[PDB]
Design a protein around this ligand. Structure first.
Ligand SMILES: Oc1c(Br)cc(-c2nc3ccccc3o2)cc1Br
Ligand SMILES: Oc1c(Br)cc(-c2nc3ccccc3o2)cc1Br
Lengths: 114, 114, 115, 115
């Protein structure tokens, strides 16, 4: 139900081997680790969770953009990119969180489908 | 070698049934029709061309954003969105032109892979 | 030395009355409140800090996009937009944090100048 | 009534000395030159037109992004960024066309105000 895709606006390519961490907001308002992985050669990270585990709640997707740029020898602005959203069962069932990265900028969108 | 994908930033969805026209620049600098189609339910338009036909050159991808917004009952800013680029054989072989649409804004990127 | 500008990609307008909260990472790795305000009729928020107060550190600029969209009677995707960055680590700079908002998307950029 | 602002997402800076050409669609459906200029050290291009001259029409703002990137010694994807829109069809408005540039991507937005 959740896929993350990361793209590079400098090289015009998928952003490969980017660390991504997903958190769920707990009842005490702390962020609890939920899922993580590294983007593939296509810039995508599949298999983070299952329908059963991905209950309604507030989730945070943290993308380690700083390490990505540093590996390329480029000095970046942001410590990371954070995407925070509510999963809602009323809405469609599959969520794609996409991020387009530049050293001093990023764009993110959600594609939510049934 | 060429795919076009269009996304909607207002609804968080693929932009479905969007007309897309591709042109190649001719030797007299006019734009000659090359390929066209309508995005699918996934927001993607596949099958525009073949490796044989897609020779080095300057290409224009025109996306009929105004009709898309009007069909949704939303007043848009742009007449259309234009993406103009050189296809170069030195670079990687497959080109994805992606566009993220809002009524008064759009973002575009190229994902170019081998 | 810190300005925040917010635009609305649906209306083609400044995003007015957007709440913005800035935090600085403390010695104990917690986010300490640093400054806050609301965007003006131009979509800009000036006067958050001074060059004396805006020392080296890791800062988080949280833009309350959800509250913005709800109030235009609209249900958006994100809770907020957060921008996290190290500032002033090579001496004082001036920072503009710009954000362009849609209900299911935002884009952010920084303009960093040396006075 | 027409301003163009261009930012650089690689450098985190205004995009300076970017050439901008504006066209208006003529009665015969050709693009007629309307105005042109270069962005300043702030990334802004003011003074393109007057409210008298900037009548109703379909306008194209062409931003010469390729020439910008080449000159920073860099090979970019797009030939230019073009923004095409109807203007002043409900009377005079003020238009800001903003563009945020990367070598393989750009984003553009409009801010339209009623004076
Ligand atoms: O499967 C995808 C998805 Br999901 C998002 C994008 C995408 N996300 C974007 C954000 C700003 C500009 C262009 C963008 O393209 C591209 C491809 Br290909
Ligand atoms: O005075 C401006 C204007 Br107009 C637009 C922008 C701007 N345009 C943007 C497009 C995408 C992401 C961030 C953006 O910021 C910034 C400033 Br500062």
């Amino acid at each position: 139900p959740l896929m993350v895709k990361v793209l590079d606006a400098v090289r015009g390519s998928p952003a490969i081997n980017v660390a991504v961490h997903v958190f769920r907001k707990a009842a005490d308002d702390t962020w609890e680790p939920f899922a993580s992985g590294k983007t593939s050669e296509s810039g995508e990270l599949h298999g983070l969770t299952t329908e059963e585990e991905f209950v309604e709640g507030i989730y945070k997707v943290e993308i380690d953009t700083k390490s990505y740029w540093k590996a390329l020898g480029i000095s970046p602005f942001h410590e990371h990119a954070e995407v925070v959203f509510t999963a809602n069962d009323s809405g469609p069932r599959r969520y794609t969180i996409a991020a387009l990265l530049s050293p001093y900028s990023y764009s993110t969108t959600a594609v939510v489908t049934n």
